[PDB]
Design a protein around this ligand. Structure first.
Ligand SMILES: Nc1ncnc2c1ncn2[C@@H]1O[C@H](COP(=O)(O)OP(=O)(O)OP(=O)(O)O)[C@@H](O)[C@H]1O
Ligand SMILES: [Ca+2]
Lengths: 20, 359
């Protein structure tokens, strides 16, 4: 998996975002 | 340290932190001069100033004012400094190569950004939804774009542009209310009509049927109360306004509606990717916020698409800010960390490194 392949896989995985 | 996400639009700018889930700063894209004000401050002093919009239809047309907006963004708005942080900027689909280079030059040489990146606005909205492949309808204040995206790549040959958005719809609502009785002459009155548009207007599933419903009873009417107490009543104008999105003819335009523009874009792509696009049609931008737009888009594309096809319209509940949020996700990823452009990399190559690094 290329550095870009692993970027797209992280986007599809999603992530938690911060607070205020 | 956290990166910054700056999303500049035709009407509004969105600024904050990569890591956050909402932009901290949201303000008009207005630079005012009679020595120079930006954003909220400038809209008030309009009486003593000439107001300028650096971003026309998503494209930066003035670079001196764009500098002033960006400056106000860090120092005045975010109360931080550009040389401490990496900066994620957003660009319009089919942004001229030179504009991209000038955007890279201004960051590094004028603000001394240690790192920067420029991403396409629609691509970011797709990311915000949790997809990497799909088609995005981005309708803002100045421009509507239909952008088919394959694994992060916006497909330039298949991107379509329509200069019909929120600003045009605000003006259209003014006109049809003027026809019905009311007079909207001042800019403080336009900012009211714009609010009416954002509060009450909706997209009809069947326009002709809805017009018949509005002509037989008052069931579709809503009352908007003014600051002075006076109440105005709106009937079919509620859905006739955003109808112009599907029938540009309402504005005297010879153009396909957002639905057929979306269809036409899918039909310009490779035949083997369409079936994913039809089922991954994401809506973004402030002008896609009308209640019932998702169901209408669904209905209209179903009529144009193969009858066997799965049609799915994704309208993220927050989509008014999906561009910024998509950037706030992207710039926060540990996997993305090496895809920035360092100040070193700029000093070694020049502005034209943007093309080989940002795609
Ligand atoms: N709830 C709503 N319903 C309808 N329209 C809305 C709503 N909220 C905002 N808008 C409209 O969306 C526009 C702003 O959206 P957005 O910030 O996505 O556009 P922009 O990025 O400033 O401009 P562009 O994308 O065209 O460059 C404004 O014209 C506003 O009137
Ligand atoms: Ca925009």
């Amino acid at each position: 998996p290329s550095p870009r392949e692993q970027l797209m896989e992280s986007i599809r995985k999603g992530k938690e975002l911060k607070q205020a | 340290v956290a990166a910054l996400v700056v999303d500049n639009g035709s009407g509004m700018c969105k600024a904050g932190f990569a890591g956050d889930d909402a932009p901290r700063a949201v303000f008009p894209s207005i630079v005012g001069r009679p020595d120079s004000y930006v954003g909220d401050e400038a809209q008030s002093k309009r009486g003593i100033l000439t107001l300028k919009y650096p971003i026309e239809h998503g494209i930066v047309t003035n670079w001196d004012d764009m500098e002033k907006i960006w400056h106000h963004t860090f120092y005045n708005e975010l109360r931080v400094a550009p040389e401490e942080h990496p900066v994620l900027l957003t660009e319009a689909p089919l942004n001229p190569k030179a504009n991209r280079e000038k955007m890279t030059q201004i960051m590094f040489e004028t603000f001394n950004t240690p790192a920067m990146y420029v991403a396409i606005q629609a691509v970011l909205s797709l990311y915000a939804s949790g997809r990497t492949t799909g088609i995005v309808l981005d309708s803002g204040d100045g421009v509507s774009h239909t952008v088919p995206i394959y694994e992060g790549y916006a497909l330039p040959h298949a991107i379509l542009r329509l200069d019909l958005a929120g600003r045009d719809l605000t003006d259209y609502l003014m006109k049809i209310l003027t026809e019905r009785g009311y007079s909207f002459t001042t800019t403080e009155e336009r900012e009211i009509v714009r609010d009416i548009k954002e509060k009450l207007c909706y997209v009809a599933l069947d326009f002709e049927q809805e017009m018949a419903t509005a002509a037989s009873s008052s069931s579709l009417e809503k009352s908007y109360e003014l600051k002075d107490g006076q109440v105005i009543t709106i009937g079919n104008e509620r859905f006739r306004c955003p109808e112009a999105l599907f029938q540009p003819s309402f504005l005297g335009m010879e153009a396909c509606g957002i639905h057929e523009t979306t269809y036409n874009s899918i039909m310009k792509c490779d035949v083997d990717i369409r079936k994913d696009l039809y089922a991954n049609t994401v809506l973004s931008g402030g002008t896609t916020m009308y209640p019932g737009i998702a169901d209408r888009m669904q209905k209209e594309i179903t009529a144009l698409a193969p009858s066997t096809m799965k049609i799915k319209i994704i309208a993220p509940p927050e989509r008014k800010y999906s561009v910024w949020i998509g950037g706030s996700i992207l710039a926060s990823l540990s996997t993305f960390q090496q895809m920035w452009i360092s100040k070193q990399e700029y000093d070694e190559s020049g502005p034209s490194i943007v093309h080989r690094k940002c795609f």
